[PDB]
Design a binder for this molecule. Sequence first.
Ligand SMILES: Nc1nc(=O)c2c(CCc3ccc(C(=O)N[C@@H](CCC(=O)O)C(=O)O)cc3)c[nH]c2[nH]1
Ligand SMILES: Nc1nc(=O)c2c(CCc3ccc(C(=O)N[C@@H](CCC(=O)O)C(=O)O)cc3)c[nH]c2[nH]1
Ligand SMILES: *c1cc(=O)[nH]c(=O)n1[C@H]1C[C@H](O)[C@@H](COP(=O)(O)O)O1
Ligand SMILES: *c1cc(=O)[nH]c(=O)n1[C@H]1C[C@H](O)[C@@H](COP(=O)(O)O)O1
Lengths: 286, 286
Amino acid sequence: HGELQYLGQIQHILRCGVEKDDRTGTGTLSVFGMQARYSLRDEFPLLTTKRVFWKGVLEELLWFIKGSTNAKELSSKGVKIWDANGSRDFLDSLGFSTREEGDLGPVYGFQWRHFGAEYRDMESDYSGQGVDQLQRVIDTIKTNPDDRRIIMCAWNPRDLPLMALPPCHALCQFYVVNSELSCQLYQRSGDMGLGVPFNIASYALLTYMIAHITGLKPGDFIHTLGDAHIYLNHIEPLKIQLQREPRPFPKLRILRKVEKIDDFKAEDFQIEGYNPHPTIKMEMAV
Amino acid sequence: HGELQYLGQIQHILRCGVEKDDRTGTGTLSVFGMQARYSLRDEFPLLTTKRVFWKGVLEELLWFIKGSTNAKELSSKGVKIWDANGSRDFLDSLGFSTREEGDLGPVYGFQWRHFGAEYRDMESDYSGQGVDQLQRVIDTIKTNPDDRRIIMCAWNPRDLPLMALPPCHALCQFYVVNSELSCQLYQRSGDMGLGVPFNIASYALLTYMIAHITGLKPGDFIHTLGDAHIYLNHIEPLKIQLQREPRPFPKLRILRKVEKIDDFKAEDFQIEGYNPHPTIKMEMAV
Ligand SMILES: Nc1nc(=O)c2c(CCc3ccc(C(=O)N[C@@H](CCC(=O)O)C(=O)O)cc3)c[nH]c2[nH]1
Ligand SMILES: Nc1nc(=O)c2c(CCc3ccc(C(=O)N[C@@H](CCC(=O)O)C(=O)O)cc3)c[nH]c2[nH]1
Ligand SMILES: *c1cc(=O)[nH]c(=O)n1[C@H]1C[C@H](O)[C@@H](COP(=O)(O)O)O1
Ligand SMILES: *c1cc(=O)[nH]c(=O)n1[C@H]1C[C@H](O)[C@@H](COP(=O)(O)O)O1
């Protein structure tokens, strides 16, 4: 199976990791530099030893492509995952006391589509200005597949101080060989219990979406970690999930041919064959 | 030994890589996503199955920290490695026909120290403007070691079109645990025969330098590849080097305590125990 790599990384961070501190004040066992490789050929990496909130996964990605930064917008669809770092309290603690709730700042979406752009408020019109990496990437795959510079980068030094919470997935690169499209991710920081599972699915999905518009077959999703940690209050839970048998990865279908990455709607995607083991609750470290 | 990982990656790219094309028009066998880990504790990763131009290695890094972009300056010291992509011909072929030879453009050095900065000519004064990642990184290690955002990024989307040759080593991150400092590198593109060997040494050196000024012990250098290729005209050569026995990695010493990363001079470093196998000539793909 493929879900064994993930389990194993967890198995390792537990028997060889080291105690560390972090901004949350919570605990953490960590390890530096790790690499796993999931196959995207006729299967989707949606963990099974636990139930993943696929709804939030899909909504968030749609939310990113949009270029939005209002943690409220995603909340409107019923995905709370980002309301925490957009809250009034969390925002005031960083000296952003003059911002309106939900303004995450120049993060993900804004970087992907308007890199150059000069940020200022979560509801300004940034169309036409900035540099669109997401699109630049697509056109290259189409015209020049062999290029070794198909990179999309979220880490923008100039803007770091305005971000309510820096890009954990900081940079990804695509590579195409013999009709199939692959993608590698560099995740400087990984919450092995909450975000990672969500992250693996988000990039596998993005790959599928790209492959479809360019007419290629998805290949491999390579996941490279930096500080792969496990918050201390996650040890008991993960320890259970580690004793669960993995069932076959599901299959994801796109029921309607789309030719613009912006035409995608939540109804265009459907999953088949998801028989996950019951959910496992884990608290988020703020 | 540690040099076996490198050899092996070469061994792999040769019996499972795939034929590919590239801008140089030369050939290439490639593989996507690879990861090696070299230990920096009481040893320096200066390859032995071949003789590495340690002089150029050291000069180039000193050249980067400086923030220089004149391929001439480094040439003045006797390190030609960058005169090729700064040449009059190479520069005119990219439409930079109004630049003076040796102006690589907003590359490495300029990004490391003056990220924000608006480039314009290789001899303008960029002091005070831009954002200094190199220094930002150092102060963090000193004040807040647990930070999971100690990143230095060279990939700057806005400037790509001005660069005569984009950052192959695009991003690196530092992590500190129990008195030792480690560093991971993401190299989107790797010329397994020429640049990589040079690159592994350049980052191990930078780590040593940082560790010294912050008073820590060097730990691990993690090398993550993207398109790890082998130009076709390198196959015969590498095939020889692969049949050579590796001798112990040398040891590097800093003979004089320095407290500013800019105070470093070439005379502050000395290597001990380097018994490499004779040189191996390989032509550069322009
Ligand atoms: N410290 C920290 N870690 C992170 O991972 C993170 C993130 C990533 C987004 C995120 C947050 C919470 C859950 C989440 O809680 N997922 C639950 C399901 C919740 C539900 O049912 O709505 C899970 O167990 O997967 C899933 C994803 C933003 N800020 C963060 N800060
Ligand atoms: N295509 C391509 N590949 C690269 O690696 C590269 C670089 C990296 C710099 C570089 C170039 C050549 C040699 C080099 O020739 N090294 C020799 C020794 C040369 C000497 O003795 O002066 C070696 O065999 O190591 C060593 C390092 C810039 N532009 C490039 N373009
Ligand atoms: C950040 C966002 C994401 O998409 N995925 C993640 O796993 N995370 C995690 C990483 C880390 O646990 C925390 C951010 O902390 P820090 O800024 O790295 O200190 O969220
Ligand atoms: C680039 C610079 C460096 O320090 N190290 C490297 O190995 N290289 C190599 C990568 C690639 O072989 C070539 C650049 O080609 P491209 O821009 O990726 O097409 O130089």
